[PDB]
Write a protein that binds this ligand. Structure first.
Ligand code: XYJ
Length: 167
């Protein structure tokens, strides 16, 4: 099924690549095995990457997520769960980064990125780097130090992308 046809990425380390792109648009071109969603524990995909991914699935992601959460209860911070990737990928790895702004432990960003290690290749965003308030430079550094498998990072904003590549 999935083909993982990534292109245009800058190689930062042996297993970490980065691109200035829309993760929804990357997922449609790449057709990856796994696309990562930066979620909350209730899998309510209200905005950011999660809202954008859900919209691209025509709200199917939210319906499947609501069914999973009503059954199995919320996730743990730093935890994750594999659901369907719908039309974007084979699977979607919903990962919950810590809500740094609301006082959750930023050390859980290591546990959040350790969920990546169960998958050979992933298309992902920077965890907790949206409204959760984690410094994206710090989120990238935890990603590099923690992820051992192949991760292709999409950063939407160009200015932040240039900051990240230069750091
Ligand atoms: C279109 N598009 C974006 O919009 C976009 N945003 C980012 S920022 C990093 C990801 C992020 O938001 N992580 S988070 O802070 O943990 C989300 C917390 N939310 C709490 C409410 O429930 C949903 C989850 N990167 C983006 N890329 C690459 C992109 O392509």
């Amino acid at each position: 099924g999935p083909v993982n046809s990534f292109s245009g990425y800058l190689k930062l380390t042996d297993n970490v690549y980065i691109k200035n792109a829309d993760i929804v648009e990357e997922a449609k071109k790449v057709k990856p095995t796994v696309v990562v969603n930066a979620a909350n524990v209730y899998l309510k995909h209200g905005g950011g990457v999660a809202g954008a991914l859900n919209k691209a699935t025509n709200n199917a992601m939210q319906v499947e997520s609501d069914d999973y959460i009503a059954t199995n209860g919320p996730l743990k911070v730093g935890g994750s769960c594999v659901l369907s990737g719908h039309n974007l990928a084979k699977h979607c790895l919903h990962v919950v980064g810590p809500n740094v702004n609301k006082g959750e432990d930023i050390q859980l960003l290591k546990s959040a990125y350790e969920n990546f290690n169960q998958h050979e290749v992933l298309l992902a965003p920077l965890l907790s780097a949206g409204i959760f308030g984690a410094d994206p430079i710090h989120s990238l550094r935890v990603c590099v130090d923690t992820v051992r498998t192949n991760v292709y990072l999409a950063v939407f904003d160009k200015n932040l992308y240039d900051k990240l590549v230069s750091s």
